[PDB]
Design a binder for this molecule. Structure first.
Ligand code: NA
Ligand code: NA
Lengths: 504, 504, 504, 504
């Protein structure tokens, strides 16, 4: 369109002429860093302009402005500034309107959309912004109720940061698809960090240490019940009149109850999140395993009741998975909570792509060796020779594992070539790649600790809504500001402490 | 010569005197950064000068200018500029001539020669250069047909970049001897990157995924036919009246057909490229293996037909090589395509030089131990004691593998010294060197992926010339410029999209 | 309070008005970088101010000033300067008073408190500060008695650095709780480094090399006495009339004497330091082991005398610990003294947190496998299957270690999964973490050598107080200054040499 | 002294007064950067000064000036400059004198002393210094006989660099004690690098590749003669009338001849160099081994002739050493010549200090285990249990290697503790340290290749003095300058080529 083409052309004379006589006009002008035109467009003698009018697509002026943010320091400063002048102009025209509280058709606030998009700068500013002109401090968030000097206590609005019945600032930062570029560090901002720390130290630390204790108890019960399973006859085994048998039956029913509980808590999670298959493992990997080691026990139950003795095969895998899943509860520790994150990454990246490169070698040399052997031990089987070759990779093989071969030069050449390629070369580069992975996710991922605490804190908070949803509310309904209408702004503020020396 | 000695001496008065009354005069003056003398030499009252006249060696003014480029940022800016003024002067004198289209006696254009030489700066500029003076935009390549604003769409000439019946911009960048210093990154330039990406996404992705599927099918057929080979009697085995035997014969003929196909596709490649022996492996290492694992099967065929049972020795090596060669088809993946490049480098550098350092130790201590042993088991053999010592290097040896030694202090001292030197010291430094190699070619070689896609794309494009050579042509014959003669410049342009904010 | 609120508000007019008509007034003003107010507050026409008056909490002006230091280069310069002007003002008012010699109620001097707090800048300046105004050089420490030119010899006060009957500058830097941030490098300052070097080279090198020799002799005696222990009957073994038996009895009594000596030297240390349990191992780890390997021998003695043959179990652990504790005496070497510090850190950090992550896997798969096995070898025991699984982690296991399993697919799947998770993945990331640890404490911890020499030098100095406490005093009682009272300042100075060229 | 104290005090008025009415006066003034005083002191109306007068200690003005150089960029510039003005002043006073040719009482020239001391800057300047004032170009070294332009050919004096019958510039840089700080890179200077390269490419490459071939032939002869040694009876074995026996006797006499040759070439080297014991291995480690593997064969000969059959023990070690010493001849290759330097460093630093830390553990746990075992196999021996424990460190041990122990908890606890401490912890930190060592001497030591070529080139040049000492002289006796006396300076110059563009 020409009327917007001229605006995008940085033309002021034509803009004024059109006034006399982002796809929206205001949004299109704003996104181009004209700035002064925004004020000129906002009000004009020929006709005024309105920002409250939402776009057909659903993005208002604020949504459009945050849309263009591309996480650049200069870009961050520009966008946050121009956002501030847009808010100031809106206040000047009519302070009654609440632009930020206004939302798109999809129910996303500018703060929530900034969080989901991953715009760290805009979210950081909006979360904490202090206005000094008292007549214009209504729409400020980071206050300074009292600064004694060395310490300058501050108050943060935290309206939709915690108590929000919609997508909140933390929910989006911890329950999203995890493709956002800076979710890892984006919750180190001023209010969120201390809010989550307070939540944990006050209300969630016990409810988590309790869950770990109950899980350990459940796993001990399950191990004891599985270890002492009857071995005579076919299931179901009729109860016997012994204290041990009844006590074991209690253990078994506890095991099955836990299994069904985990199955349902997994199914409800997968209906709540609807994770994409391509991102099924990357995002929620600690949630797939708790579901699978309950699927195993459900299969075990159905096999056990249907006159079958293969249920042990299922139950044993469930037991091993249940024990090895106690690394999900190390997220509550910084020092030891990074080992559960190294295994997760190495099993999915370093050990998943490297298996294709290895099974090729193993199968090639296995077929070679097995065809070389006449069989005229029973080593002619492909499985047996594929297992004898695997032992070489873990340093407990034996060169002379067969003699049915007619040719001794060729067989030993093949075996030595395999040993050199896999034991000495492939292993020593897989280990090198694991070195790089450990480097990375031990030097930069030291705050996946914080991210995992955010996820578990939100999970527990959602869990205990029935117990205390409104009561378990962070922050105090304190008075820090006054509205233009004359009412007192009672905001759910969160006290904060900070110190600075050089400023004096 | 004095007339050129004065020019090389930065003398202007003597140059003017000589005018009144790089080995070429114009080229010699140009290479010295006189610049103004180039204009002065080009035309003069006493007599004019011509640039179209090719030198006796074969380098014109443009070839000579690109010759001196030494890949320096300041040098790159200087050479590209002075190249631009040479083109402008040539246009001013007579726009009819086409200097760049002009070539040397060897058929190399300035762009092609710049590509082969490895001059990244000159090639980058010439590939994309935009002229703003409309009267002088004839010899421009990177146009801006329309810039809407945030997006500024561009057009690239791409005359000899793809559809060239001569050494093209991509052919030289992907089918050369690979001694060029920046071939790895040199195809990240504006037009080439997106041209190759479009070629792959449109026309080559299927033709490659088809080849990998057919190779997997061929290898499965070959493995099945080799695994179920008859073991009774001597070859050739007469066909039996069984479904299995006939089906196996079909498999065998497919195997031999594939073998001969690979043999011929290797021989034709080695006659097409004529690779130097010193660079036989460095450049085309994935091409030697496909040839060798076909030589093995041809040897197997000739042995099989000539009443011989050692053909199994050849066929087994062919089978193992064929299976392990499926890492050639991982070039089409970024994540897993770097494991095929780590093996290639480590087998040729880290594991080839380190074997000399190890066979010395193995042979020294083997001879020592074998002479120490009287034999008064049959361990006196040099092979047996060289194998017993090798097991120590891969952690499955045994100290007391013999007792024929008269001296127990000396034999155990030798064995412990060998174990400490090879198992604990040589292995743990070979692994460290592999660490450095993996570091390098996992941090910088992440675009050998792109380079290998360039090679395979060119290979497939040459393969399907009969199917669609002219039809499978990239770019559209679009109108972006006008020649001085008045004809419309219909150029095989390639649309491109780009965005910039700060410029405004 | 308002009178101090105004001061903290950087108000000068109100300060002057209050004068006319850190919690202390002077300290509160000083900590805020008013500086000029300190001089104004010190003396005033309306009323003067005194700094000698100690605060109720116990911090004087100097203690308060050093309290605010936060180890910042600009902060260090500011605090050291303002400290210097406070000293100068105190001298001007009345040079008779000795502020620095003055101490708090807890017996801490400003230097000692600066050392304990970890303030490197303040301690570095106070230790070496040179005054050029001769009338004001009384309270200087780093003198220049004579500077020949290229060499400028210097004298350092070293009053409480060595000969202090209180918490001294070295004692605090080497016998504290080790939570101080820069104790590692904080004793590289001018006087302390050369003082400790002189102490070692003169008086302590022999007394330490003697102790190592005596410990080696004691361990050889103990090993010989334990190796040739009687094996017939039950203890106590009655002495026999043989030279060997009597000589062994002498060895045994020497062993027990050494054991009781170590027990008491450990108990007295733990009553001297009162280390917190949370820091029991981090701080004094080389002191726990010498105590434990004496507790073992005391338990061995009490078992031996009370008609018991399990004393061998205790004595053997004591012997192994005593031999492996000879790495405590490698602190006296730079090159080999870093291996005793790598083991200390890796056993407490890399191998302590990683065991939890491993015992989970071992126990999970052990329970899985043992429940899978019917036992219908005696491998049903949990211990046997937990040991068979452990061998896999150290590369000497065997896949087919049992056959009592009914299901062969499941058992081998479990075994291969365990081998891949623990042998190939957990080990290769524990080794990577050990790589980072070794990197760190081999590149930065190369002065834990110096720190350990400081600790051992102080230990030996305290040990030999009875031999020569006053006589073994560092520095000479030399004359470098004169007091205002007219007496000659005979200070225990330590000569030092230094060279500078550029200053000229 | 006062007359020099004033000079060291930067006093000019007192210096002038003393004139009217480094320990030497001129040297003392020069070393202090007075500069102008040097000219003032050199000549004065009251009395002149002379620089040719050598000091009592033996350092002249030039030696004293180079003495103070401390390898600092600003210091290097200052010292080289002031050296140049001293030379210019000496020329002005009387060009007849040759100060640089003048030497101290010990026979060291300023260039030679600068080389030995390790002063890179002074040596670099003196080796190549160009003077432009033609009247003052006599004492210049780096000439420019003709500069065509892009290429500026240069001539270098190289008087004592190669043909010097005294300590030369290369001899000192390659046959010194190796404690010099920058010997590694100090021979990358302009003339030395190309001089050594020319020497190798022309005269030494063959004489070295010949020596390696002859050594390989000698080792093959020795291996063949030792492998087929008679086994019947006692030595000396009387010759038998067989072709094989006579041919073996020829091999044996060749072996002994080579052994005695190596013994004498080692003894003469150790009398030529007189290496200090503390630096016996650091400096010449490739020279100790060739001597030791000849001592072994001499011991073998003396045992063989004196009716003894233990000569095999000596000869076998000699054979193993001779084979493993072929890594001395990899210095002539860049790519593979760094493996012989990694072994040299790791055997002396990483594996020598780490053995003390390991033998402590091995002996402690060996004594513990052996005393724990009653023996009521023959595992009670200390050697057997020390070997069974060592196998654990190289991953081929066995937990249940004995059953004579009464206590099974304690024995297995000890074994597991040993395995965890040594196999899993000590090995994985020794490997980490080897990682650092390989990092270093593979990233910075890539020119120990050049240094070793320098040493071998000098060795071969000294070897072939009888063949062609004067004839095998580098450089041409060319004319580049003229002396003040009028004679033509025919200097043994070495042509050199260089190119520069930016200077123009
Ligand atoms: Na093994
Ligand atoms: Na191993």
């Amino acid at each position: 369109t020409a009327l917007h083409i001229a605006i995008e052309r940085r033309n002021m004379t034509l803009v004024t002429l059109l006034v006399e006589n982002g796809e929206l006009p205001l949004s299109l002008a704003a996104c181009t860093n004209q700035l002064a035109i925004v004020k000129f467009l906002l009000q004009n003698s020929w006709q005024p302009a309105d920002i409250s009018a939402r776009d057909s697509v659903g993005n208002t002026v604020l949504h459009a402005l945050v849309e263009v943010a591309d996480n650049t320091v200069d870009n961050t400063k520009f966008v946050t500034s121009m956002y501030n002048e847009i808010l100031i102009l809106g206040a000047k025209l009519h302070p009654t309107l609440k632009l930020e509280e206004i939302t798109n058709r999809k129910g996303l606030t500018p703060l929530a959309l900034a969080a989901s998009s991953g715009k760290i700068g805009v979210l950081a500013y909006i979360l904490q912004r202090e206005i000094h002109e008292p007549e214009c401090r209504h729409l400020s968030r980071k206050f300074t109720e009292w600064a004694y000097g060395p310490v300058h206590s501050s108050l943060y609005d935290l309206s939709c940061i915690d108590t929000c019945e919609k997508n909140s600032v933390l929910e989006v930062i911890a329950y999203s698809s995890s493709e956002t570029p800076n979710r890892h560090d984006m919750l180190l901002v001023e209010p969120l960090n201390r809010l989550l720390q307070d939540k944990w130290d006050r209300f969630v630390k016990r409810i988590f240490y309790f869950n770990f204790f109950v899980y350990c108890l459940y796993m001990i019960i399950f191990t004891a019940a599985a270890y002492y399973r009857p071995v005579e006859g076919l299931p179901p085994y009729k109860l016997k009149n012994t204290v041990g048998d009844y006590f074991r039956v209690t253990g078994e029913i506890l095991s099955v109850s836990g299994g069904v509980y985990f199955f349902f808590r997994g199914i409800q999670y997968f209906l709540q999140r609807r994770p994409s298959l391509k991102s099924l493992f990357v995002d929620s990997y600690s949630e797939i395993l708790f579901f699978v080691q309950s699927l195993f026990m459900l299969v075990s139950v159905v096999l056990y009741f249907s006159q079958r003795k293969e249920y042990v095969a299922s139950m044993v895998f469930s037991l091993a998975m249940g024990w090895t899943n106690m690394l999900y509860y190390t997220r509550g520790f910084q020092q030891m909570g990074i080992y559960a994150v190294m295994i997760e990454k190495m099993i999915l990246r370093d050990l998943c792509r490297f298996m294709f490169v290895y099974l090729v070698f193993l199968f090639g040399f296995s077929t070679a060796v097995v065809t070389l052997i006449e069989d005229g031990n029973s080593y002619n089987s492909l499985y047996s020779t594929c297992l004898e070759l695997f032992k070489f990779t873990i340093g407990m093989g034996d060169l002379e594992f067969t003699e049915n071969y007619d040719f001794k030069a060729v067989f030993i050449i093949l075996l030595l070539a395999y040993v050199i390629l896999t034991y000495i070369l492939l292993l020593n580069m897989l280990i090198a790649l694991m070195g790089e992975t450990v480097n990375k996710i031990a030097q930069e991922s030291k705050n996946i600790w914080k991210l995992q605490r955010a996820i578990t804190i939100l999970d527990t908070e959602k869990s205990f809504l029935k117990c205390m949803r409104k009561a378990f509310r962070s922050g105090k309904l304190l008075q820090v500001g006054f509205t233009p209408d004359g009412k007192d702004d009672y905001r759910w503020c969160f006290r904060v402490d900070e110190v600075n020396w050089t400023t004096w």
